[PDB]
Amino acid sequence: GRNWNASWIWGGQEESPRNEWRCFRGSFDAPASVEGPAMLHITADSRYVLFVNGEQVGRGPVRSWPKEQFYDSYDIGGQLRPGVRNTIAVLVLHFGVSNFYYLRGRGGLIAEIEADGRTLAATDAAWRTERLGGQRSNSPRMACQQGFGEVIDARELAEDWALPAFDDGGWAQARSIGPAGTAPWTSLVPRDIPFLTEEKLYPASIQSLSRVKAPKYAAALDLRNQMVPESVNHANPVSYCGYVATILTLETSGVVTLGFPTGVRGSGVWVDGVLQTEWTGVQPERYYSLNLAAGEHLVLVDITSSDHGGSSHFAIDSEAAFTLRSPAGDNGVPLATIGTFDQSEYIDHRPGRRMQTDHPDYRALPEAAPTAAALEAFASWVKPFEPSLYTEENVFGSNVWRTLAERRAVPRSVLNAILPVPEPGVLPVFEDGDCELVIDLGAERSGFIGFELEAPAGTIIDAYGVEYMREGYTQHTYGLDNTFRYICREGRQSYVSPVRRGFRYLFLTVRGNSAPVKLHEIYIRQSTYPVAEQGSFRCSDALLNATWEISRHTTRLCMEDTFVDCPSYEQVFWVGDSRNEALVNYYVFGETEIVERCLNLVPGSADETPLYLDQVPSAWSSVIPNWTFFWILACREYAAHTGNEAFAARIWPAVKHTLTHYLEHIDDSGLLNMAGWNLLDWAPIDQPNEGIVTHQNLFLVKALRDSRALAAAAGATEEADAFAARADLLAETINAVLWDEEKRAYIDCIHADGRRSDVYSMQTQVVAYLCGVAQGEREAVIEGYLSSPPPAFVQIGSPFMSFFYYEALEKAGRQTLMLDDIRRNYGQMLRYDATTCWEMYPNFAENRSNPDMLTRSHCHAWSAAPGYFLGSSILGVKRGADGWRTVDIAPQPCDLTWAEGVVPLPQGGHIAVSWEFVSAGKLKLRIEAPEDIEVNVTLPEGIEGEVTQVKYMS
Ligand SMILES: [Ca+2]
Ligand SMILES: [Ca+2]
C-alpha cells in the first residue's frame, strides 16, 4: 500500500445507513506548476463516483474483502487547473446491507491528491458533505446479490453540486472516522487491475410505443430485512414464518384484484379469514379476484419461506376506490407483518437448526382473526413495517402488471430519441395513460443508463431493462428489480444512473406529464474490463462464425473488475464460472491481470472456511466443492498460460491448504463424503447435499494431481507427492465402488443412508473421462457414450457442462461431433436472436422461475465455449509450453473448407493462422508468430499441403 495523509470521512449521525447516496466536496489551491504526475488515491464504502473540477473521472472501488480494501490511483493532470482553486467532488453510495460482492462496513470516503511527494489535498473535517438531494433511501433492494435500484426526485436535487462554482456554504462539515487502517478496512491495498471502460453507445431501434397504466397500488417490500432485522449483516439465506397484513377499505362495493408480480411466498392468501382458492397468472405471477362489498376487509398473505434477499412485490387494483392501513401502530406504511414465529439462517457447509412451521399462533391465526378486531388477540405478533424497507414507487411491479397495455405505431419523431442528432424525439401525450417506449439496444449490454430530456416538473421517468422478449412475450427479470425511477425538475436535464444494469431491451415509461416531453437522447454507457478484439476466428460455416461472435460478446460483458456470472441478475464473481471464462478470454481477448486478480481473491475466504467460498468477496458463506476444484484448475492454467512461476509460488500455499481440508472429508469408504451443496450441472443429476457424489469425487482426484503443476512451478514439487498418493487411492476406490457392471457406467452417487443411486447421467461419465479415472475398457465404454449419449441417461443441461463435454471430445479426437453439437445447441440460441450465450438449455426445470423459459440468464460467459474451442480445437492453435514459448499448430478442418483466426499471446504479439483446401485432401496453411516462438506443425490425418510460416520481430 502507501502511507496516507488523509482521513476516512462520512456525514450524518448513522454510521452505516441503508441505501444512502452521499455527496462530498473538497477544494484546494493547486501550485502554478507541478513536475511529476498529480495522483489522486481513493477508495470508499460502498462505492464511489469521482469528479475533478466538475468532470467525472472514474468509478470504484473494485470489489474487496474489507480486510484488504482496494483503492484507486488516478493521474488527474488532465483535469487539474494549475495556479488556481480546484474542486474535488465525490458521490458515495453506501449500501448498509451485505451482498454477494460487498461486506457491510460503514459509510466512508478517503481520498488524497499527491504530487512531487507533497499532499495537495486530503479528505478531512474541512470537507463538506450532504446526502444527494431527492435520493430515496427506501428504494427497492435490487437483488439478493446486489445493491439497490434507485428512485431520484430531481426537484430536490442540486444538479450542479459537483461543479467548481457550486455554493456549498450551507453544507455541513464532514466527520472524520480515523486515519488509514481504522476498522473495518484493516488495510488499504492498491487496485490490482487497470480501470474499466465507459463508452457511450446509442440504441439500435425503438421496438414499440404503448399507452399503458400501472396498478393503482404497487409496492416493493424487503421482507427479509423486515422479518429478520439482523439479516442485513450477511448474505446467507434466511427463513422466516409469518404474514403480511393490511386492512383494505372499499368506499363502495366492487371487484378488487390482488397482484403478486413475483408470486405468493407462503401457503396462500386470506381475506376476512377465508382462504382464497382461485387465482390466475403465469408462474411465478399470481392474481386474485375479489368480489367485495363496501367496508373494511383484513387481507392476510402468508410469506413463510426462505428468502435470500431482494424485493417482494404486492399490488392492488380496482375500478372502485379503496384505502389501506396497517393493523398495527401507524408509522406511514399501510402494511404490517405478523411474526416472526420462527426463523433460521442457512450456511450450506455447516449444520444448523432449521425453521419449523408449526407454531400454534401461526397455524390458527388466519381463520382465528377474520377481522382486525379479532386480530387484537394476536397483537403481540403484529408489528409495523420498517419505512426504509417499503416503497410504493415500484417500477418493476408497474411493468410486470400493467392494467392497460395498448400498442400504438411508433411516430418517426420518436426515433430521434435514440439517434445522435440535434432534433429531439417528441413523445405523444395520452389523455388517459402513460407513454411506454421499448428501446432495443440491438444486443445485450452492461452499464450505466443515461438520458437527456425536457419535461414539466414532476414528470416520472421509469426505466426497466430485460434481456429477452418475443412476439408479445416479455421475460421479466423476476428476482431482479432492474430499474430506477427519476422524477423530473422543470425544464431540460440529464441523468446517468450510477447503478450498473445488464439488459438488451429498455422499457422507458413516462408518466404524469401534462405537457409533451422532449427526449433528446436515451443511451447506455457500457462498462467492461478493458478488452480489445485482439483475438479472432472466422470460417466457411456462417453459423459457427455467429456462435463465436456471441461467445466473444458474452465474455466481454462478463468481465468487470472481476469475471462475473452474468451482467443482469447477479454481476457476481462466481469461482466455477471463471475457469471457463478465463480460457475463452485467453483466446478472444488475451487479458491476464483480471485472471490473477480473481484467483488471488479466493483465498481471502479462508477465514470463513478452508474449503473456500464459491463466490467472492461475498457475505454469502457458501461452498461448492467443484468450484474450488475449478479454482485450482484455473490457477494451474493461469500459471501455465503466463509461465508466471512467481505467482505459482505465491498461490501454492492456498492450494495446498484447501486440498488438505478436502481430504479430511474422505471417510472409511475412502470416498469424499460431504454434507453441503454438491453441485455440478443444472440437470436431474442425483447430486444430493447428502453424502458421496461421484462427479466431485472424480474432480478431487484431478485437482490433487493438477496441484503438482503449481507445486513444481513453485519450486516445491515434493510438497505435492502426498496428494498424488491420495489421488491414486481415491481413483481406485472410485472404480471399485462407484462403478456399475450391469450398466457399465459410474453411478451418480451414494446417498446418506448408503443407498446407491440408480440414476445415470452423461455428466458423471464425461467427468470420469476427463479426470482420467476411467481407463482401459471403462475408458472405451465412456467414449462410446460420448459419441452416442444414451437417451435414458440424464442429459447435459447447460452450455457450462457442454464445455467439459467438448474437452472430452477433443481428448477423444471427435472434433466433427463437437462442431455438430455446437451448431445444434448454440444454433438454437441464435434461432431466438440471442446476442450472448444462455446460462442454461431449454426444457430443464432447474434454476428458472418458469419451466417454459428458454433460460434464466441469457448472458453467462461460463457458456462461451465456442470462443475457446473454435480457435483451439478447429483452427488448430494450442499452447505448446508454459508462457507460449512454443506453439502447436494442428488444424482439424472437419467439414469446413477454410478457417482463419488470431490468438493473442500473454508476452505480447500473437499467433495468426489461416488455412483452406485448395484441392481434395490438400491444404494451404499460413502461420505468423514472433520469431522467438517455436512452432510445431501437424497437418490433419491424410492431408497434404503447403505451409507458409512467417516470423516477425518481438
Ligand atoms: Ca439529441
Ligand atoms: Ca521474418
Coordinates of all heavy atoms in Angstrom, one line a residue, residues 314-374:
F314 N -46.1 -6.6 -4.1 CA -47.5 -6.6 -3.8 C -48.2 -5.5 -4.5 O -47.8 -4.3 -4.5 CB -47.7 -6.4 -2.3 CG -49.1 -6.5 -1.8 CD1 -50.0 -7.4 -2.4 CD2 -49.5 -5.8 -0.7 CE1 -51.3 -7.6 -1.9 CE2 -50.8 -6.0 -0.2 CZ -51.7 -6.9 -0.8
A315 N -49.3 -5.8 -5.2 CA -50.1 -4.8 -5.9 C -51.6 -5.0 -5.8 O -52.0 -6.1 -5.6 CB -49.7 -4.8 -7.4
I316 N -52.3 -3.9 -6.0 CA -53.8 -4.0 -5.9 C -54.4 -3.0 -6.9 O -53.9 -1.9 -7.1 CB -54.3 -3.6 -4.5 CG1 -53.6 -4.5 -3.4 CG2 -55.8 -3.7 -4.4 CD1 -54.0 -4.1 -2.0
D317 N -55.5 -3.4 -7.5 CA -56.1 -2.5 -8.5 C -57.6 -2.8 -8.5 O -58.1 -3.9 -8.2 CB -55.6 -2.8 -9.9 CG -56.1 -1.7 -10.9 OD1 -55.5 -0.6 -10.9 OD2 -57.0 -2.0 -11.6
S318 N -58.4 -1.8 -8.8 CA -59.9 -1.9 -8.8 C -60.5 -0.7 -9.4 O -60.0 0.4 -9.5 CB -60.4 -2.0 -7.3 OG -61.8 -2.1 -7.3
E319 N -61.7 -0.9 -10.0 CA -62.5 0.2 -10.6 C -63.2 1.0 -9.5 O -63.7 2.0 -9.8 CB -63.5 -0.4 -11.6 CG -62.9 -1.1 -12.8 CD -63.9 -1.6 -13.8 OE1 -65.2 -1.5 -13.5 OE2 -63.6 -2.2 -14.8
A320 N -63.1 0.5 -8.3 CA -63.7 1.1 -7.1 C -62.6 1.7 -6.3 O -61.4 1.2 -6.3 CB -64.5 0.1 -6.3
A321 N -62.9 2.8 -5.5 CA -61.9 3.4 -4.7 C -61.7 2.6 -3.4 O -62.5 2.0 -2.9 CB -62.4 4.8 -4.3
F322 N -60.4 2.7 -2.9 CA -60.1 1.9 -1.7 C -58.9 2.6 -1.0 O -58.1 3.3 -1.6 CB -59.7 0.5 -2.0 CG -58.5 0.3 -2.9 CD1 -57.3 0.0 -2.3 CD2 -58.6 0.4 -4.3 CE1 -56.2 -0.2 -3.1 CE2 -57.5 0.3 -5.1 CZ -56.2 0.0 -4.5
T323 N -58.8 2.2 0.3 CA -57.7 2.7 1.1 C -57.0 1.5 1.8 O -57.6 0.4 1.8 CB -58.1 3.7 2.2 OG1 -58.9 3.0 3.2 CG2 -59.0 4.8 1.6
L324 N -55.8 1.8 2.4 CA -55.1 0.7 3.1 C -54.5 1.3 4.3 O -54.1 2.4 4.4 CB -53.9 0.2 2.2 CG -54.1 -1.1 1.3 CD1 -55.3 -0.9 0.4 CD2 -52.9 -1.3 0.5
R325 N -54.5 0.5 5.4 CA -53.9 0.9 6.6 C -53.4 -0.3 7.4 O -53.9 -1.4 7.3 CB -54.9 1.7 7.5 CG -56.0 0.9 8.1 CD -56.6 1.8 9.2 NE -57.7 1.1 9.9 CZ -58.9 0.8 9.3 NH1 -59.1 1.1 8.1 NH2 -59.8 0.2 10.0
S326 N -52.3 -0.1 8.2 CA -51.7 -1.1 9.0 C -52.6 -1.5 10.2 O -53.2 -0.6 10.8 CB -50.3 -0.7 9.5 OG -49.8 -1.6 10.4
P327 N -52.6 -2.8 10.5 CA -53.4 -3.2 11.7 C -52.6 -2.8 13.0 O -53.2 -2.9 14.1 CB -53.5 -4.7 11.5 CG -53.3 -4.9 10.0 CD -52.2 -3.9 9.7
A328 N -51.4 -2.4 12.8 CA -50.6 -2.0 13.9 C -50.5 -0.5 14.0 O -51.2 0.2 13.3 CB -49.2 -2.6 13.7
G329 N -49.6 0.0 14.9 CA -49.5 1.4 15.1 C -49.0 2.1 13.9 O -48.1 1.7 13.2
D330 N -49.7 3.2 13.5 CA -49.4 4.0 12.3 C -48.0 4.5 12.3 O -47.5 5.0 13.3 CB -50.4 5.2 12.2 CG -49.9 6.1 11.2 OD1 -49.9 5.7 10.0 OD2 -49.6 7.3 11.5
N331 N -47.3 4.3 11.2 CA -45.9 4.8 11.0 C -45.7 5.2 9.6 O -44.5 5.5 9.2 CB -44.9 3.6 11.4 CG -44.9 2.5 10.4 OD1 -44.0 1.7 10.5 ND2 -45.9 2.5 9.5
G332 N -46.7 5.3 8.8 CA -46.6 5.7 7.4 C -46.8 4.6 6.4 O -47.2 4.9 5.2
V333 N -46.5 3.4 6.7 CA -46.6 2.2 5.8 C -47.9 1.5 6.1 O -48.2 1.1 7.3 CB -45.5 1.2 6.0 CG1 -45.6 0.0 5.1 CG2 -44.1 1.9 5.7
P334 N -48.8 1.4 5.2 CA -50.2 0.8 5.3 C -50.2 -0.7 5.5 O -51.2 -1.3 5.4 CB -50.9 1.2 4.0 CG -49.8 1.2 3.0 CD -48.6 1.9 3.8
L335 N -49.0 -1.3 5.7 CA -48.9 -2.7 5.9 C -48.2 -3.0 7.2 O -47.5 -2.2 7.8 CB -48.1 -3.4 4.8 CG -48.5 -3.2 3.3 CD1 -47.5 -3.9 2.4 CD2 -49.9 -3.8 3.1
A336 N -48.5 -4.2 7.7 CA -47.9 -4.7 9.0 C -47.5 -6.1 8.7 O -48.0 -6.8 7.9 CB -48.8 -4.6 10.1
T337 N -46.6 -6.7 9.5 CA -46.2 -8.1 9.4 C -46.5 -8.7 10.7 O -46.5 -8.1 11.8 CB -44.7 -8.2 9.1 OG1 -43.9 -7.6 10.1 CG2 -44.4 -7.6 7.7
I338 N -46.9 -10.0 10.7 CA -47.2 -10.8 11.8 C -46.2 -11.9 12.0 O -46.1 -12.8 11.2 CB -48.6 -11.4 11.7 CG1 -49.6 -10.4 11.3 CG2 -49.0 -12.1 13.0 CD1 -51.0 -10.9 11.0
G339 N -45.4 -11.8 13.1 CA -44.4 -12.8 13.4 C -43.3 -12.1 14.2 O -43.6 -11.1 14.8
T340 N -42.1 -12.5 14.1 CA -41.7 -13.7 13.3 C -41.8 -14.9 14.2 O -41.0 -15.1 15.2 CB -40.2 -13.5 12.9 OG1 -40.1 -12.2 12.2 CG2 -39.8 -14.6 11.9
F341 N -42.7 -15.8 13.9 CA -43.0 -17.0 14.7 C -41.7 -17.9 14.8 O -41.5 -18.5 15.9 CB -44.1 -17.8 14.1 CG -45.4 -17.0 14.1 CD1 -45.8 -16.4 12.9 CD2 -46.2 -16.9 15.2 CE1 -47.0 -15.6 12.9 CE2 -47.4 -16.1 15.2 CZ -47.8 -15.5 14.0
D342 N -40.9 -18.0 13.8 CA -39.7 -18.8 13.8 C -38.9 -18.4 12.6 O -39.4 -17.8 11.7 CB -40.1 -20.3 13.7 CG -38.9 -21.2 14.1 OD1 -37.9 -20.7 14.6 OD2 -39.0 -22.4 13.8
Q343 N -37.6 -18.7 12.7 CA -36.6 -18.3 11.7 C -35.4 -19.1 11.7 O -35.2 -20.0 12.6 CB -36.3 -16.8 11.8 CG -35.8 -16.5 13.2 CD -35.4 -15.1 13.4 OE1 -34.2 -14.7 13.1 NE2 -36.3 -14.2 13.9
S344 N -34.5 -18.9 10.7 CA -33.2 -19.6 10.7 C -32.4 -19.0 9.6 O -32.8 -18.4 8.7 CB -33.5 -21.1 10.4 OG -34.1 -21.3 9.2
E345 N -31.1 -19.3 9.7 CA -30.1 -18.8 8.8 C -29.4 -20.1 8.2 O -29.0 -20.9 9.0 CB -29.0 -17.9 9.4 CG -27.9 -17.5 8.6 CD -26.9 -16.6 9.3 OE1 -27.0 -16.5 10.5 OE2 -26.0 -16.0 8.6
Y346 N -29.3 -20.1 6.9 CA -28.7 -21.3 6.2 C -27.3 -21.1 5.7 O -27.0 -20.3 4.9 CB -29.6 -21.7 5.1 CG -29.2 -23.0 4.4 CD1 -29.0 -24.2 5.1 CD2 -28.9 -23.0 3.0 CE1 -28.6 -25.3 4.4 CE2 -28.5 -24.1 2.3 CZ -28.3 -25.3 3.0 OH -28.0 -26.5 2.4
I347 N -26.4 -21.9 6.3 CA -25.0 -22.0 5.9 C -24.9 -23.4 5.3 O -24.8 -24.3 6.0 CB -24.0 -21.8 7.1 CG1 -24.4 -20.6 7.9 CG2 -22.6 -21.7 6.6 CD1 -24.3 -19.3 7.1
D348 N -24.9 -23.4 3.9 CA -24.8 -24.7 3.3 C -23.7 -25.7 3.5 O -23.7 -26.8 3.1 CB -25.0 -24.5 1.7 CG -23.9 -23.7 1.1 OD1 -22.7 -23.7 1.6 OD2 -24.2 -23.0 0.1
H349 N -22.6 -25.2 4.2 CA -21.5 -26.1 4.5 C -21.3 -26.4 6.0 O -20.3 -26.9 6.5 CB -20.2 -25.5 3.9 CG -19.9 -24.2 4.4 ND1 -18.9 -23.9 5.4 CD2 -20.3 -23.0 4.0 CE1 -18.8 -22.6 5.5 NE2 -19.7 -22.0 4.7
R350 N -22.3 -25.9 6.8 CA -22.3 -26.1 8.3 C -23.7 -26.6 8.7 O -24.7 -26.1 8.3 CB -21.9 -24.8 9.0 CG -20.5 -24.4 8.7 CD -20.3 -23.0 9.3 NE -19.0 -22.4 9.0 CZ -18.6 -21.2 9.1 NH1 -19.6 -20.3 9.5 NH2 -17.4 -20.7 8.8
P351 N -23.7 -27.5 9.7 CA -25.0 -28.0 10.2 C -25.7 -26.8 10.9 O -25.0 -25.8 11.3 CB -24.6 -29.1 11.2 CG -23.4 -29.6 10.6 CD -22.6 -28.3 10.2
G352 N -27.0 -26.8 11.0 CA -27.7 -25.8 11.7 C -29.2 -26.0 11.8 O -29.8 -26.8 11.1
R353 N -29.8 -25.4 12.9 CA -31.2 -25.5 13.2 C -32.0 -25.0 12.0 O -31.7 -23.9 11.5 CB -31.5 -24.8 14.5 CG -33.0 -24.7 14.8 CD -33.2 -23.9 16.0 NE -34.3 -23.0 15.9 CZ -34.3 -21.9 15.0 NH1 -33.3 -21.7 14.2 NH2 -35.4 -21.2 14.9
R354 N -33.0 -25.7 11.6 CA -33.9 -25.2 10.5 C -35.2 -24.7 11.1 O -35.7 -25.3 12.1 CB -34.1 -26.4 9.5 CG -32.9 -27.0 9.0 CD -31.9 -26.1 8.4 NE -30.6 -26.7 8.2 CZ -30.4 -27.7 7.4 NH1 -31.3 -28.2 6.7 NH2 -29.1 -28.2 7.2
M355 N -35.8 -23.7 10.4 CA -37.1 -23.1 10.8 C -38.2 -24.2 10.7 O -38.2 -25.0 9.8 CB -37.4 -22.0 9.9 CG -38.8 -21.4 10.1 SD -39.2 -20.2 8.8 CE -39.8 -21.3 7.5
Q356 N -39.1 -24.1 11.7 CA -40.2 -25.1 11.7 C -41.5 -24.2 11.5 O -41.5 -23.0 11.8 CB -40.3 -25.9 13.0 CG -39.5 -27.1 12.9 CD -39.6 -28.0 14.1 OE1 -39.4 -29.2 14.1 NE2 -40.0 -27.4 15.3
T357 N -42.5 -24.8 10.9 CA -43.8 -24.0 10.6 C -45.0 -24.6 11.4 O -46.1 -24.6 10.9 CB -44.1 -24.0 9.1 OG1 -44.4 -25.4 8.7 CG2 -42.9 -23.5 8.3
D358 N -44.8 -24.9 12.7 CA -45.9 -25.5 13.5 C -46.3 -24.6 14.6 O -47.1 -25.0 15.5 CB -45.5 -26.9 14.0 CG -44.2 -26.8 14.9 OD1 -43.6 -25.8 14.9 OD2 -43.9 -27.9 15.4
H359 N -45.8 -23.4 14.7 CA -46.1 -22.5 15.8 C -47.7 -22.4 15.9 O -48.3 -22.1 14.9 CB -45.5 -21.1 15.6 CG -45.6 -20.2 16.9 ND1 -46.8 -19.8 17.3 CD2 -44.7 -19.8 17.7 CE1 -46.6 -19.0 18.4 NE2 -45.3 -19.1 18.7
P360 N -48.2 -22.7 17.1 CA -49.7 -22.6 17.3 C -50.4 -21.4 16.8 O -51.5 -21.5 16.2 CB -49.8 -22.9 18.8 CG -48.6 -22.3 19.3 CD -47.5 -22.9 18.3
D361 N -49.9 -20.2 17.0 CA -50.5 -19.0 16.6 C -50.4 -18.8 15.1 O -51.4 -18.4 14.5 CB -49.9 -17.8 17.3 CG -50.1 -17.8 18.8 OD1 -51.3 -18.1 19.2 OD2 -49.2 -17.4 19.6
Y362 N -49.3 -19.2 14.5 CA -49.2 -19.2 13.1 C -50.2 -20.0 12.4 O -50.8 -19.6 11.4 CB -47.8 -19.6 12.6 CG -47.7 -20.0 11.2 CD1 -47.7 -19.0 10.2 CD2 -47.5 -21.3 10.7 CE1 -47.6 -19.3 8.8 CE2 -47.4 -21.6 9.4 CZ -47.5 -20.6 8.4 OH -47.4 -20.9 7.1
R363 N -50.5 -21.2 12.9 CA -51.5 -22.2 12.4 C -52.9 -21.8 12.6 O -53.8 -22.1 11.7 CB -51.2 -23.5 13.0 CG -50.0 -24.2 12.5 CD -50.0 -24.5 11.0 NE -48.7 -25.2 10.6 CZ -48.5 -25.6 9.4 NH1 -49.5 -25.5 8.4 NH2 -47.4 -26.2 9.0
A364 N -53.2 -21.1 13.7 CA -54.6 -20.7 14.0 C -55.0 -19.4 13.4 O -56.1 -19.1 12.9 CB -54.9 -20.8 15.5
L365 N -54.0 -18.4 13.5 CA -54.2 -17.0 13.1 C -55.1 -16.7 11.9 O -56.1 -16.0 12.0 CB -52.9 -16.4 12.9 CG -52.9 -14.9 12.6 CD1 -53.9 -14.1 13.5 CD2 -51.5 -14.3 12.9
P366 N -54.8 -17.3 10.7 CA -55.6 -17.0 9.6 C -57.1 -17.0 9.8 O -57.8 -16.0 9.7 CB -55.2 -18.1 8.6 CG -53.7 -18.3 8.9 CD -53.8 -18.3 10.4
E367 N -57.6 -18.2 10.2 CA -59.0 -18.3 10.4 C -59.5 -17.8 11.8 O -60.7 -17.5 11.9 CB -59.4 -19.8 10.3 CG -59.4 -20.4 8.9 CD -58.0 -20.6 8.3 OE1 -57.0 -20.4 9.1 OE2 -57.9 -21.0 7.1
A368 N -58.6 -17.7 12.7 CA -58.9 -17.2 14.0 C -59.0 -15.7 14.1 O -59.5 -15.1 15.2 CB -57.9 -17.6 15.0
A369 N -58.7 -14.9 13.1 CA -58.8 -13.5 13.1 C -59.3 -13.0 11.7 O -58.6 -12.4 10.9 CB -57.4 -12.9 13.3
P370 N -60.6 -13.2 11.5 CA -61.3 -12.8 10.2 C -61.5 -11.3 10.1 O -61.8 -10.8 9.1 CB -62.6 -13.6 10.3 CG -62.9 -13.6 11.8 CD -61.5 -14.0 12.4
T371 N -61.2 -10.6 11.2 CA -61.4 -9.1 11.3 C -60.2 -8.5 12.0 O -59.5 -9.2 12.7 CB -62.7 -8.7 12.0 OG1 -62.6 -9.1 13.4 CG2 -63.9 -9.4 11.4
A372 N -60.0 -7.2 11.8 CA -58.9 -6.5 12.5 C -59.1 -6.6 14.0 O -58.1 -6.5 14.8 CB -58.8 -5.1 12.0
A373 N -60.4 -6.6 14.5 CA -60.7 -6.6 15.9 C -60.2 -7.9 16.5 O -59.5 -7.9 17.5 CB -62.2 -6.5 16.1
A374 N -60.6 -9.0 15.9 CA -60.2 -10.4 16.3 C -58.7 -10.5 16.3 O -58.1 -11.3 17.1 CB -60.8 -11.4 15.4

